[PDB]
């Protein structure tokens, strides 16, 4: 099976944020969580989600109502493996706000640690 780098390359041109967060689920069940949750966070400020499990990457747009300039933050999530039964979430920065995204980032933390899947 391939290095996680490798994995890595399937992201978008963008910035890859240094942040991991660490699940104590092995990949496929902590993606299929990740969609039900963001697909269900809409009112977050979240739009034009898209989920591909066989790539285990979500893309999608955080908003906002600035009336003048754009100010989204087009991003990427991608779930890797992280040893027997864990896995890791890195996030990928498109555009837009390196701040915005990583709130994204510590909300999916704190959910993911209410439901106890946090390594």
């Known amino acids: 099976?391939?290095?996680?780098?490798?994995?890595?390359?399937?992201?978008?041109?963008?910035?890859?944020?240094?942040?991991?967060?660490?699940?104590?689920?092995?990949?496929?069940?902590?993606?299929?969580?990740?969609?039900?949750?963001?697909?269900?966070?809409?009112?977050?400020?979240?739009?034009?989600?898209?989920?591909?499990?066989?790539?285990?990457?979500?893309?999608?747009?955080?908003v906002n109502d600035s009336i003048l300039f754009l100010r989204s933050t087009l991003f990427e999530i991608m779930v890797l493996p992280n040893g027997d039964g864990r896995s890791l979430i890195k996030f990928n920065k498109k555009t837009g706000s390196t701040k915005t995204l990583t709130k994204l980032a510590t909300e999916i933390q704190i959910i993911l640690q209410k439901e106890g899947v946090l390594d």
């Open 1 to 62: 099976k391939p290095p996680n780098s490798v994995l890595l390359k399937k992201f978008s041109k963008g910035k890859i944020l240094e942040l991991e967060i660490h699940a104590k689920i092995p990949e496929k069940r902590l993606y299929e969580g990740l969609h039900k949750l963001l697909e269900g966070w809409k009112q977050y400020g979240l739009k034009n989600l898209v989920f591909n499990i066989t790539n285990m990457i979500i893309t999608g747009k955080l």
